[PDB]
Amino acid sequence: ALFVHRDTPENNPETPFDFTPENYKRIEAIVKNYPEGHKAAAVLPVLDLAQRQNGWLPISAMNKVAEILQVPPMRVYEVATFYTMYNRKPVGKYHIQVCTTTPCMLRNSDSILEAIQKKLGIKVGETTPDKLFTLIEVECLGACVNAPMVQINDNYYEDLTPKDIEEIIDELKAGKIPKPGPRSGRFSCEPAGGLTSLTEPPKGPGFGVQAGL
Amino acid sequence: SNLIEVFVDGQSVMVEPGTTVLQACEKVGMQIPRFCYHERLSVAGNCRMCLVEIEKAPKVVAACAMPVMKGWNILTNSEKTKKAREGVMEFLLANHPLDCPICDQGGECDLQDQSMMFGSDRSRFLEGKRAVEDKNIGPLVKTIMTRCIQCTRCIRFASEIAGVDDLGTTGRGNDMQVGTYIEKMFMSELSGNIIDICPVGALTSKPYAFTARPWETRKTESIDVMDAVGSNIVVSTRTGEVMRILPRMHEDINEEWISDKTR
Amino acid sequence: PFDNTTYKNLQHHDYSTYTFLDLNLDLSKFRMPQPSSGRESPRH
Amino acid sequence: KKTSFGSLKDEDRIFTNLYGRHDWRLKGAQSRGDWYKTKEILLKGPDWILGEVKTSGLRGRGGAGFPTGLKWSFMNKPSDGRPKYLVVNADEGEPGTCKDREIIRHDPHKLVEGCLVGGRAMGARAAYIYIRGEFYNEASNLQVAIREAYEAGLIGKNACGSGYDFDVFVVRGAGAYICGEETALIESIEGKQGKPRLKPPFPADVGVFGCPTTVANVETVAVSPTICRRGGAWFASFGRERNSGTKLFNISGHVNNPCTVEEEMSVPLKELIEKHAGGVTGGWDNLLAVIPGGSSTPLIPKSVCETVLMDFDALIQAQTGLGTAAVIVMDRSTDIVKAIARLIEFYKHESCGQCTPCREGVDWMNKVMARFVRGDARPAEIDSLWEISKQIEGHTICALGDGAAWPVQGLIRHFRPELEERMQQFAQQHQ
Numbered sequence: 001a002l003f004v005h006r007d008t009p010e011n012n013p014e015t016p017f018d019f020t021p022e023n024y025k026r027i028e029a030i031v032k033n034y035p036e037g038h039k040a041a042a043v044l045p046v047l048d049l050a051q052r053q054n055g056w057l058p059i060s061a062m063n064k065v066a067e068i069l070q071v072p073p074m075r076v077y078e079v080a081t082f083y084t085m086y087n088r089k090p091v092g093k094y095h096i097q098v099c100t101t102t103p104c105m106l107r108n109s110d111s112i113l114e115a116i117q118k119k120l121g122i123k124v125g126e127t128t129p130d131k132l133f134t135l136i137e138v139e140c141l142g143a144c145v146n147a148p149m150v151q152i153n154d155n156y157y158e159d160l161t162p163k164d165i166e167e168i169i170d171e172l173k174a175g176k177i178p179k180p181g182p183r184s185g186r187f188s189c190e191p192a193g194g195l196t197s198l199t200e201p202p203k204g205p206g207f208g209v210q211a212g213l
Numbered sequence: 214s215n216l217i218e219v220f221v222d223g224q225s226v227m228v229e230p231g232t233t234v235l236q237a238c239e240k241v242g243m244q245i246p247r248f249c250y251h252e253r254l255s256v257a258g259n260c261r262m263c264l265v266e267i268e269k270a271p272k273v274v275a276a277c278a279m280p281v282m283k284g285w286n287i288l289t290n291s292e293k294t295k296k297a298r299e300g301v302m303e304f305l306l307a308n309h310p311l312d313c314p315i316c317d318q319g320g321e322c323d324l325q326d327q328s329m330m331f332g333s334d335r336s337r338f339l340e341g342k343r344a345v346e347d348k349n350i351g352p353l354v355k356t357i358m359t360r361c362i363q364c365t366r367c368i369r370f371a372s373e374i375a376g377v378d379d380l381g382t383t384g385r386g387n388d389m390q391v392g393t394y395i396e397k398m399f400m401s402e403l404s405g406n407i408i409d410i411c412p413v414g415a416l417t418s419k420p421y422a423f424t425a426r427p428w429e430t431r432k433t434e435s436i437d438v439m440d441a442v443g444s445n446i447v448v449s450t451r452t453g454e455v456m457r458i459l460p461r462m463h464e465d466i467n468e469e470w471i472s473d474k475t476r
Numbered sequence: 477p478f479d480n481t482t483y484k485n486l487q488h489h490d491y492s493t494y495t496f497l498d499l500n501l502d503l504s505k506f507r508m509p510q511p512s513s514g515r516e517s518p519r520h
Numbered sequence: 521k522k523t524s525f526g527s528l529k530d531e532d533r534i535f536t537n538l539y540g541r542h543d544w545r546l547k548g549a550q551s552r553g554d555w556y557k558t559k560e561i562l563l564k565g566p567d568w569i570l571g572e573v574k575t576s577g578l579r580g581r582g583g584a585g586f587p588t589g590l591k592w593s594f595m596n597k598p599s600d601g602r603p604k605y606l607v608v609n610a611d612e613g614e615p616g617t618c619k620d621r622e623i624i625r626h627d628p629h630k631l632v633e634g635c636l637v638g639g640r641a642m643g644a645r646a647a648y649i650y651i652r653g654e655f656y657n658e659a660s661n662l663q664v665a666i667r668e669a670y671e672a673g674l675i676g677k678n679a680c681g682s683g684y685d686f687d688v689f690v691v692r693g694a695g696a697y698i699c700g701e702e703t704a705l706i707e708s709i710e711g712k713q714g715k716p717r718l719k720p721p722f723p724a725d726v727g728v729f730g731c732p733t734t735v736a737n738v739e740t741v742a743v744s745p746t747i748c749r750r751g752g753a754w755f756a757s758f759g760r761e762r763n764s765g766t767k768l769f770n771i772s773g774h775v776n777n778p779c780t781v782e783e784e785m786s787v788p789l790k791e792l793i794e795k796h797a798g799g800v801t802g803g804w805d806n807l808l809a810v811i812p813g814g815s816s817t818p819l820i821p822k823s824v825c826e827t828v829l830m831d832f833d834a835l836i837q838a839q840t841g842l843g844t845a846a847v848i849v850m851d852r853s854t855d856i857v858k859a860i861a862r863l864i865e866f867y868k869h870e871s872c873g874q875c876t877p878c879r880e881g882v883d884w885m886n887k888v889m890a891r892f893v894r895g896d897a898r899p900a901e902i903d904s905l906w907e908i909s910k911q912i913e914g915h916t917i918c919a920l921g922d923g924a925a926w927p928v929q930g931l932i933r934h935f936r937p938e939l940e941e942r943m944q945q946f947a948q949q950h951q
């Protein structure tokens with residue numbers, strides 16, 4: 001949790017990184033989304049791309065993005081250390097992120113944190129010896145009505161209970177892909193035990209349209 | 214022709230459009246407090262020491278950044294203004310280290326002086342303070358970054374004046390840190406100037422370190438001969454010895470900067 | 477037959493690491509030419 | 521006039537695929553009435569569209585609640601040579617708020633159509649949809665929905681066949697609540713730290729890439745096509761005067777059935793919780809406090825919750841605000857000081873650090889609130905904390921600073937005896 005860089009044998013400007021040819025084509029499309037003369041707007045998406053290819057951001061990757069976009073390296077470092085989704089240390093294969101802000105706290109997200117810690121034998125902020133799971137607390141993930149919820153890599157797992165989360169870790173260790181979403185009865189954000197709205201057939205085109213178009 | 218009339222504490226003054234509230238106060242000889250604003254740097258508006266009341270406006274405005282509007286009355290000394298300064302000074306000093314006796318800025322420090330003139334006379338902060346690691350940026354500027362107040366003057370000067378995009382802020386929140394992220398030296402021919410524009414003892418002259426105090430120096434206004442520009446300088450001496458070189462403002466020559474060889 | 481009992485947003489169960497950027501690459505043939513500020517960058 | 525509000529009907533619900541029970545892709549969206557007579561709306565001109573939005577009484581759904589037709593009309597002016605843009609705020613970062621998430625993934629074509637309709641009103645050439653980076657799957661749904669519209673001619677060149685060129689770009693965030701702030705969002709698009717800008721200039725003059733920009737919430741833009749189709753008067757027939765239309769509500773916390781639901785504005789808070797959320801856990805009598813509009817709004821105790829209505833003007837009178845309309849419910853088992861202390865901890869982690877009162881003040885408030893949770897303080901410190909919050913409020917660059925102060929003030933305003941009691945317990949234990 002430090003915001004200074006000290007070169008180490010596995011993280012220095014000579015650490016091998018470079019985009020694959022497939023990613024170099026994705027980068028071209030990213031840059032075309034912005035006006036000519038404002039290529040620096042691509043810093044966030046291109047940095048994220050480097051992390052998706054590599055899993056984390058060595059300083060060499062930051063320099064590579066700076067070189068590609070012709071942006072001073074410090075301006076890339078500033079972005080990398082501001083946004084919390086960028087990993088400047090290697091993380092596990094599965095980055096478990098437990099929301100602990102108040103709405104999730106009110107639904108016993110602490111029990112979810114306990115279940116993950118007891119099952120994995122690690123503490124918040126640590127990685128397992130096998131380097132499969134890294135566990136952190138995060139702020140509201142925009143799924144508060146489905147609390148308690150966690151994010152693992154790109155997926156949300158919601159309305160959790162200590163049992164449900166323990167199963168998901170079993171599925172990940174075994175190599176399977178657990179389907180995202182609520183683990184209770186419901187499918188998304190509707191009230192449990194039956195809809196209280198949107199029960200009628202949706203109205204079709206042209207319904208209630210004002211005269212004169 | 215296009216000058217507009219504004220009032221500073223009820224005193225009319227005619228100012229060009231685009232003039233900020235801070236610049237309007239200057240015209241009547243009132244200097245608004247500031248930390249992040251430097252007239253030769255880009256406007257930042259982040260320290261909030263320049264907050265000033267506009268009559269009938271419920272919100273204090275940042276004087277350094279807010280353009281004046283015709284008929285505005287700036288209350289530079291209202292209780293609303295004075296309370297804003299006290300609140301900001303209190304936040305500025307909450308984590309600042311108790312370093313004045315060992316800090317080279319002592320005696321010519323804008324934080325000290327504005328705390329005296331515009332802040333409260335005591336603390337109500339009952340927590341532990343932040344402490345930051347120092348960073349080595351070369352043999353000329355010593356960094357004691359726990360004193361930094363995150364005004365970003367050094368960043369803007371390095372980017373705009375010196376044309377070096379090496380300084381920046383990393384992290385965010387209370388943990389936001391000014392520096393180079395990596396181990397880098399800020400070795401520009403104009404680097405030493407960031408000692409002058411840093412309002413606090415975060416950036417100080419390494420050669421000058423610990424040798425004098427401001428009140429005991431004699432200022433000899435003189436000229437630089439290290440090149441052919443003829444930069445106006447102040448030769449600081451004490452008890453018959455030259456202690457340091459400072460810039461002297463000359464708009465048509467060196468503005469308020471000197472080169473590192475001159476310094 | 478109107479069915480209000482099944483979740484119909486199950487495609488994202490099969491999204492992968494490059495789905496978003498692959499779609500962005502796919503969309504590139506549809507975009508209008510970008511405007512220009514007249515220089516390569518503010519540093520030019 | 522109408523005197524009671526609520527009991528909205530499905531016939532009059534804008535977001536009809538709120539629960540993902542129907543197809544979210546173009547085929548489903550069209551059958552539900554999206555993209556219908558979009559060409560007619562575009563050929564009626566910006567002044568007609570802004571008038572429809574002006575007459576609808578729509579107010580910003582992002583939190584500030586600023587009237588939308590008036591705000592959008594700032595772009596209604598001749599071009600000076602720069603391009604014009606509509607930035608759509610899909611950051612959805614306010615704790616308790618998840619309404620925008622359902623719109624993006626289940627009704628993406630309403631947002632995409634809203635982008636074009638609102639973009640036409642402002643004369644914008646494209647829309648950038650800034651969606652938080654943690655919504656990867658929702659962002660992929662949106663790009664799929666955007667691709668279908670491009671392939672149907674509904675956007676891009678000659679959009680809908682109206683002779684109007686409009687692009688819809690999706691740009692993802694990287695983890696920062698402060699990038700929901702309008703100007704901090706713009707700096708993020710430009711590839712900088714998400715630090716807000718001072719105003720002036722206002723975005724309608726100097727926005728993204730230095731160009732005229734309007735930042736609109738996802739919900740604000742998603743309902744815009746329907747208001748144009750069904751008319752502003754239809755939308756204005758809902759909710760109290762100046763509090764018009766249908767609102768998305770998130771009821772979370774200590775309810776039996778936490779959910780997102782669309783309900784008429786000015787619905788009573790009590791009715792909303794009982795009707796849709798199944799009521800407070802342990803009975804309505806087990807209610808302690810409610811945060812009515814997301815974490816930034818001050819809480820209210822059970823007594824106020826009894827009769828308060830859910831709209832901008834009603835909640836301002838209760839010394840709070842509608843905010844994002846995210847209702848966080850706390851029953852009597854809650855440690856209220858701990859619950860509010862966790863929100864101040866959230867603002868501490870989300871402050872961009874740019875400006876002094878929030879960079880230093882919020883962290884100071886967090887350190888004090890942590891001691892209040894344990895009672896390791898003195899009663900005189902309560903008034904000190906109130907004064908500190910007032911030094912942050914109205915002195916910062918952006919409204920995150922105000923949003924950190926208000927929860928603290930709400931706790932002190934309604935639960936001061938709880939704070940003093942905890943200090944009494946701590947003092948007598950170490951006595």
Ligand SMILES: Cc1cc2nc3c(=O)[nH]c(=O)nc-3n(C[C@H](O)[C@H](O)[C@H](O)COP(=O)(O)O)c2cc1C
Pocket residue numbers: 579580581582583584585586591609610611612613614697698699700701702703735736737738740741918919920923
């Ligand atoms: C800290 C902070 C976070 C915000 N987050 C969001 C957000 O996630 N989504 C949003 O629509 N507005 C957010 N806002 C409000 C925006 O600044 C802005 O008022 C709004 O997006 C304008 O859109 P509207 O007029 O349609 O409501 C936030 C404001 C602040 C101060």
Ligand code: SF4
Pocket residue numbers: 309310311312313314316317318319320322323324325360412413414415
């Ligand atoms: S910077 Fe100023 S206030 Fe801070 S320790 Fe040095 S002299 Fe004292």
Ligand code: SF4
Pocket residue numbers: 360361362363364365366367368391410411412413415416
């Ligand atoms: S080091 Fe000095 S000039 Fe730079 S941000 Fe800190 S206080 Fe300001």
Ligand code: SF4
Pocket residue numbers: 698715716870871872873874875876878879916917918919920921922
């Ligand atoms: S109030 Fe906080 S988040 Fe907003 S600009 Fe100031 S420091 Fe940044």
Ligand code: FES
Pocket residue numbers: 099100101102103104105139140141142143144147149615616617
């Ligand atoms: S509080 Fe956890 S998702 Fe919002």
Ligand code: FES
Pocket residue numbers: 246247248249250257258259260261262263264275276277278
């Ligand atoms: S001098 Fe104006 S905010 Fe710093």
Ligand SMILES: [K+]
Pocket residue numbers: 318407408409410411412413414415416417
């Ligand atoms: K200094």
